[PDB]
């Protein structure tokens, strides 16, 4: 017996949908769900989605509360829908996928991912749930995550981090590093060798290597000297150039983190969604240097150094393609006299 | 197990709330309730009330579908709340009363009208439902309707008409004429002698007496001659004066009905609610004669004639009070040289 | 170059989307689209759909303005989507189908119905548009309408009427009677023998046979005598019984039309959508007789007489299935001593 | 002369409703109130309540701007309505009570708390306002606060802190510690002996005793040794266990504050309201340890130690009831072999 | 070809409107603009203005992204509209001006500021754009900013700071200090000699002189001794008096910044807009001292000291007028026995 009042009862008593029996009084006003608590209305949910308020409330209550892949990974792997769960996208305050399978009567296209309506969609399967590995084997298109070996299936070790209730973390009390598998048209696809983005924040950035510790603690010229980075334009690409009206370079998150500790700046997230490469309209508060579209990627500095040092520097300009988070990221590489001028995630 | 989906199931399958088990998918968008029917959304309800959309939907689904007293009668009798029913006010597209008793968890102040929260409120009791005559006996304040006699209690015969699903009618297949009883502080009141308004429409007006048939069929001067109405200003009060910029008189619905058959006119219902006296901003389309506040009452022409002929015509101006639909209606009576100049429901 | 301003320009200048170049200023406020005309805002569209206002505006502007099958026919034939058109559902003030093909970038699942996304969906094809008969030949699932014959394919003659801009009519200046073809999994189906509903209105009902003329002009007992209908409960089923609180029978639109000419009544369309059988909460204004769920079908009286006269009257109660508008309609048949007691479209 | 424009004038010129004469131009759009300031609209208020925008604006403008009891105290004391003031609930961005007395024409149930409509409600009275102590003496149900002695009335010394414009504080320039009194059915009730919650925040937590200073500065094992807390499960209850997928214990705010200084974590306030015990869906960012419903109380560590040390530890499981903020708080006490296993505010 | 989809394409690809060709799918729901990105809706803009959502979206996309005068300066100079640009007011999340010139078809009153509709309005002109100095010379009313000399026009050196994408800053990589010019009724007006407010924040306040460094680092009595400020009531005016229920003085931002480092407090910005003098409802969290209307100005402490030391202290009370940000600011000066009691920006 699925109902708005039962979903609300579960949120109030269990912190989320937990299949418990019960009902609480609910009032819906505009895009907000309230419940009566001792005569007064208490807000349970504000709809920030393009779905009807009561439908979005139910999908949010039915969100997966285990560590799940970050939405950028699912998107890069072509995931269209999840099997019998909701992957909540905390970057967008919305369900990661339009439709559901066995979750909500309003958004369900099927009750089971074995229904033929699901065959053309890449269904997300979670091996931690009974029967989901078998459902992936029977699925025409799909992405599977597991905590271990699936007999005969060649795995892809994914990122160390996962999203647990919107908190991206590397698990200590829980497992966040999964094996990934993908099928396209009934055929298991070999996932490519890839780098992974680190998913760090500007305000709580922590270094994850000796090189990263040295970047944050050492001065620009001594770091470049220590890591033999002369001629690789790190002064522009990583540290950033704030001397002209147009802000130069600044494409690695660690470079923004170093700058942030000294001088504040505004980052306008004009397409707010989870993605491997992020685009910001940046305004440096100290200098007034700005850039409408500043592409930023959070790679471990060692990974970025390996990528830039593995390029041929004899061409004026060329597209450099790098697999990051399972997707092909195009970078624009500009050279002059055998040295780098700039290297940035190519603005499509 | 009360729920939005269960209320919606009942509306879809039973035409209203009928206590049936079942659920249908629902979507709420702004003030509208939809249900999914074969992949597409179908509108079930548009909220025109000041209550939350899902709460108003439930009270409307739980509306009384038997002939009930017209809201103007309940209001005139001081009814605050109904016992275990919702009197739906079709003039306002809203519940007639703010709160409920044993109807909806969001609006309920009590489950049974015997709860002490109900003692100071005039509760409406319906003798057609088992135990309601007995609950009126135990209630401090209340109004009771019955189809037959109540032992020891003398009845007040109500109007012939009742509202059945928003259609005011005099029943032939159902009883619409009720016996009324009222208690104030545990004491059964003596309800006053009263006239009743006829609750007719302008577009489907039917005469209910030989005098009314004669008013509609005869010319003004011969009707006044036949019923000895000279000096009673019916030319102004009932027929209406459309010769000046300000529309004169026209306070009886039968007079508006007679005019409507010949020439159309606009009636702006600027306070849309059920009331004994209605106020309209009228604009006569043929002449351009108009009046911002034209008070209109639908009395049987014989009743209006009895009222006007029972007045002292020796005073220039005075307030004439008449019990109509159990309430005191003030009329302004203007006389000159022993004859009526005007007589209208006093705009206060 | 598709845009809101271009869609609005087409509506203002062409009465609908006509592929014309141009832009007009637009303002969107809540669910309404306005355009500036000489300094003031003029309403172009009010969104009554569950889609975003600008998306619904575009689909409505791009509606098919030729006579098209009534939505009840398309639904009964399992149509999921239309090829390169929008079938506007005027009963719901919304698009008949969730998604589009080659119509609007927000709702398109494909640009051409030959895309593999369309293969599992029953696509509606219109033989009056070039290449659509050929696209039906290549489609896995679909419904085709034509004005003439299709080589090798045997046709199913559809209803005489079609919907032209929301007006259901039998064409004189345009063709409204189509040949129907349907394919399921690449195989041209044999469409079943079917009756068709007449799609008439209560307020403008016209008889379409001598029997129907006789039903409307003759008295109940002489019509039943003339057409040898004794023992078939037409007094209850067709004419209606208004003598008890629950309105008896009244399931044929012609019976409601005959009643409507004499006495008015309220029909509450509680599931407002196009369907072969309609359900109304009816309240007879004259008697006060009412029914929460009164199923009404508009069959030609001759067709209804053929159906009822082709039934075995020896069973107390049974389900009678009749193909109407290509769908299986279940009727409940109740008999006693070899005569009909009642026969109604089964409320399920 | 109460008006929207006058309320807006007071907000603009006095910072709140101050009974001043004047009007400013106002525009209402959706749930926001604006005023024209030199040709442009400036936002004065955004309605986050379930009341109409103009009504909520007026109640917020008419909010009590003196230190008042925290809403959790008023709720625990059964307060239904306030006499001639609005207690604004800053946790909910809404009025603490549905109705008013002598405040706003839309929400007023009475002008004076002596009206019989108020007799069944527990009215809040403020002794700092002339005549309110006398109104409490005449009230059938009520809660009174005073800054001093009321002759013959036995007082209850309340918490040190009060809310002043949504800032909970212990007054230095103003008095925040009141005497509390309560009446139920005309009878003055003896308020129970109680502990009080400290109303601290996680981000600005300050210790209020030597034990609390020692908890925050000392390591877990030396604090437990110093205060003889061996066998009382403080490692689980207060410090928290982050080693398993389900976060263990962590029910005292001081324990969360200590953790917060070292590692950040997410606290989802899924029922956002003021209450003695708060429930959070917690996700520890460092470990990934989480709990859907983690009940947290802010007791002074000395008070919590007194409570836990005053319990019999010979039973496996039992409900321990403790008066906190005038209300009975149930705790679940789990013991094994004479030692505590867990002790938490019982999830109802 | 201006369109909603083209504006959205520019925002997605260029970070703002940049005149680029292209379209992206857009959905408008209530007051939010979304775009489809790989099947899911991503929020591009939330309308906080009183304009229609699509119109506000376009004006925000077309905002001036160069350093522009702060809105408080434009308002103080009487600016009504901008020539061929939108000055976005980040304090109000809205356009600084109601109408536009050559920007958006919905808000344009003209395409060029030379149109006679513009003659009575004070048009803002930007000398950094070709032809704008000439348009100011031809304009009847206007305000011009330049980065240099305009032949024959006497300049006014404006504030050092400008707003760049809502970040107020003193430019290093860009010029933020402009020359200002104003015309009223075809006549160039001499701008008055003025002080400028410093436009600092409470949370990131930095001193801009040795006196300001000394105010923040020295104790109250030694700063007053060092700068010979005895008898000038800085203890009240600048430092603030938190000893009584009504918070005394505290009218200089530097005084609030000094207090903020020690004890937190709530500043309610009840008229949220950019202005030379700001009014806050302040509540000191430590003491509970509060003031409904606390006028605060951010003057450099040296400028405030010069103003207060340039006043005659022999009158009990008088209005002191000071030009600040080109506007006349009235201050109330209260003296006793030749010493200052209080000096505050006069509450109108
Ligand atoms: C006070 C009171 O007598 N109420 C009654 C009596 C009866 C017979 N019905 N209701
Ligand atoms: C399967 C199939 O034969 N479809 C056809 C054939 C023709 C002549 N039209 N459509």
Tab-separated table of N, CA, C and O in Angstrom, chain C residues 60 63-65 71 87-94 163-167:
chain	number	residue	atom	x	y	z
C	60	UNK	N	1.401	22.308	-28.609
C	60	UNK	CA	0.082	22.796	-28.983
C	60	UNK	C	0.181	23.582	-30.295
C	60	UNK	O	-0.613	23.338	-31.195
C	63	UNK	N	0.398	21.178	-33.211
C	63	UNK	CA	-0.671	20.214	-33.305
C	63	UNK	C	-1.090	19.999	-34.752
C	63	UNK	O	-0.950	20.878	-35.606
C	64	UNK	N	-1.597	18.807	-35.014
C	64	UNK	CA	-2.102	18.417	-36.308
C	64	UNK	C	-3.428	19.167	-36.503
C	64	UNK	O	-4.348	19.043	-35.682
C	65	UNK	N	-3.513	19.943	-37.576
C	65	UNK	CA	-4.714	20.716	-37.885
C	65	UNK	C	-5.536	20.111	-39.043
C	65	UNK	O	-6.370	20.796	-39.631
C	71	UNK	N	-8.830	10.588	-30.206
C	71	UNK	CA	-7.883	10.005	-29.257
C	71	UNK	C	-8.365	8.644	-28.703
C	71	UNK	O	-7.560	7.726	-28.579
C	87	UNK	N	-0.683	14.852	-31.955
C	87	UNK	CA	-2.126	14.686	-31.911
C	87	UNK	C	-2.519	15.392	-30.617
C	87	UNK	O	-2.117	14.957	-29.537
C	88	UNK	N	-3.192	16.546	-30.720
C	88	UNK	CA	-3.595	17.294	-29.551
C	88	UNK	C	-4.892	16.733	-29.028
C	88	UNK	O	-5.859	16.585	-29.771
C	89	UNK	N	-4.903	16.423	-27.752
C	89	UNK	CA	-6.055	15.888	-27.058
C	89	UNK	C	-6.828	17.064	-26.439
C	89	UNK	O	-6.442	17.568	-25.395
C	90	UNK	N	-7.892	17.501	-27.118
C	90	UNK	CA	-8.740	18.603	-26.713
C	90	UNK	C	-9.616	18.278	-25.512
C	90	UNK	O	-10.096	19.202	-24.864
C	91	UNK	N	-9.849	16.985	-25.218
C	91	UNK	CA	-10.604	16.610	-24.026
C	91	UNK	C	-9.735	16.863	-22.789
C	91	UNK	O	-10.247	17.278	-21.767
C	92	UNK	N	-8.425	16.635	-22.884
C	92	UNK	CA	-7.503	16.847	-21.781
C	92	UNK	C	-6.729	18.161	-21.850
C	92	UNK	O	-5.956	18.433	-20.948
C	93	UNK	N	-6.860	18.951	-22.931
C	93	UNK	CA	-6.053	20.168	-23.179
C	93	UNK	C	-4.571	19.832	-23.075
C	93	UNK	O	-3.823	20.532	-22.414
C	94	UNK	N	-4.175	18.716	-23.679
C	94	UNK	CA	-2.803	18.232	-23.573
C	94	UNK	C	-2.411	17.398	-24.779
C	94	UNK	O	-3.282	16.932	-25.512
C	163	UNK	N	-11.614	14.103	-35.658
C	163	UNK	CA	-11.492	15.327	-34.914
C	163	UNK	C	-10.723	16.354	-35.769
C	163	UNK	O	-9.591	16.099	-36.174
C	164	UNK	N	-11.337	17.503	-36.051
C	164	UNK	CA	-10.657	18.585	-36.768
C	164	UNK	C	-10.571	19.781	-35.818
C	164	UNK	O	-11.590	20.387	-35.501
C	165	UNK	N	-9.385	20.038	-35.274
C	165	UNK	CA	-9.174	21.112	-34.307
C	165	UNK	C	-10.089	21.008	-33.100
C	165	UNK	O	-10.577	22.019	-32.592
C	166	UNK	N	-10.319	19.777	-32.661
C	166	UNK	CA	-11.146	19.508	-31.503
C	166	UNK	C	-12.625	19.436	-31.771
C	166	UNK	O	-13.393	19.257	-30.835
C	167	UNK	N	-13.044	19.573	-33.030
C	167	UNK	CA	-14.451	19.472	-33.405
C	167	UNK	C	-14.600	18.109	-34.057
C	167	UNK	O	-13.977	17.858	-35.086
